[PDB]
Write a protein that binds this ligand. Structure first.
Ligand SMILES: CC(C)(COP(=O)(O)OP(=O)(O)OC[C@H]1O[C@@H](n2cnc3c(N)ncnc32)[C@H](O)[C@@H]1OP(=O)(O)O)[C@@H](O)C(=O)NCCC(=O)NCCS
Ligand SMILES: CC(C)(COP(=O)(O)OP(=O)(O)OC[C@H]1O[C@@H](n2cnc3c(N)ncnc32)[C@H](O)[C@@H]1OP(=O)(O)O)[C@@H](O)C(=O)NCCC(=O)NCCS
Ligand SMILES: CC(=O)NCCCN
Ligand SMILES: [Mg+2]
Ligand SMILES: [Mg+2]
Lengths: 150, 149
């Protein structure tokens, strides 16, 4: 029996998780649309190489982390991408993101991943403090490029 | 036809492994055709991966490997241009240009938001290539890594 847990998300959690997923999208500039957020959360959940971990405190989902499998051609090995991390404001600064990333790290090690990689906004200093505390090192060697199609 | 940029098939993998091993060596890996081919086949069997090869008179001159990406913010998919390589003998002949032009057409057909990639900051050649193909340098995001091995 427990009162707090970080565990893999299930289909049964998607309805509650969609609210936090919609909040994460709003943080990134998106207009709130619970129905759209939920439909796409279901597509990502039903994607073979994606893994969602959620943080539940007193039966409430406080946050989540979405990871997906990466393939490193140079190393000829897999790794994990920490795609999205979010904690709802009511539960911030209580160690939720820390616990979510700690479980993400233990999971990646269990999967013999090379590393966990991510990209976060340069203007998001709060996230840089979180990732550095968790053992992430800033990549300097690479430059991102986008070719916009729509 | 005498030249073509097309999807890779199972039959191209023995020859494609040689190019993929060459691409690995450019990024500093030791040559190992068995390891290169085994991983190439694992990526080729991934349902979200897409390989295009440039073939000049039955010789593979180069390739591009793309994979599906999900944008949570846009609630839409996109493509990541993961690997691009042209064997030195066939360089500065438009092989990479044709591979990327095909990748863009494929991404548009798939209704992708964009094609995204990462390349070394000191790789002058790749920056000229991607800029020629309409890619824009983006420094609004910072990459972090948590090394496990
Ligand atoms: C960033 C975010 C995930 C942090 O979640 P959280 O549960 O509040 O974080 P924690 O309580 O585990 O904090 C862990 C560490 O992160 C850093 N951190 C977290 N919030 C911070 C803040 N507001 N300012 C500075 N550092 C902060 C600190 O180093 C902190 O350690 P400390 O509290 O001992 O100083 C949360 O604020 C959030 O959802 N933000 C919006 C989405 C986002 O930016 N995600 C990252 C990109 S995917
Ligand atoms: C980069 C690379 C793929 C280019 O392949 P390529 O088939 O020779 O390229 P193309 O002939 O299609 O050239 C397309 C454009 O790229 C640029 N380019 C290509 N080679 C270049 C070079 N040596 N110097 C400068 N710009 C160059 C030019 O803008 C060129 O247009 P142009 O020929 O009209 O001037 C090839 O040099 C290679 O395999 N390099 C090693 C692997 C690599 O760097 N891949 C990317 C790592 S993330
Ligand atoms: C950690 C992080 O990547 N945040 C941006 C969300 C799209 N990847
Ligand atoms: Mg890769
Ligand atoms: Mg994403």
């Amino acid at each position: 029996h427990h009162h707090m847990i970080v565990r893999r998300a299930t289909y049964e959690d998607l309805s509650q998780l969609a609210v936090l997923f919609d909040e994460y999208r709003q943080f990134y500039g998106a207009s709130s649309n619970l129905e759209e957020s939920h439909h796409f959360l279901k597509q990502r959940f039903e994607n073979k190489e994606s893994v969602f971990f959620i943080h539940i405190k007193d039966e409430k989902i406080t946050g989540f982390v979405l990871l997906y499998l990466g393939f490193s051609s140079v190393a000829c090995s897999t790794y994990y991408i920490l795609d999205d991390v979010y904690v709802t404001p009511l539960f911030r600064r209580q160690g939720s993101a820390k616990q979510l990333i700690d479980t993400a790290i233990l999971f990646a090690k269990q999967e013999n991943a090379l590393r966990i990689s991510l990209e976060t906004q340069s203007n998001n200093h709060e996230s840089h403090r979180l990732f550095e505390k968790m053992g992430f090192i800033r990549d300097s060697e690479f430059q991102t490029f986008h070719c916009f199609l729509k």
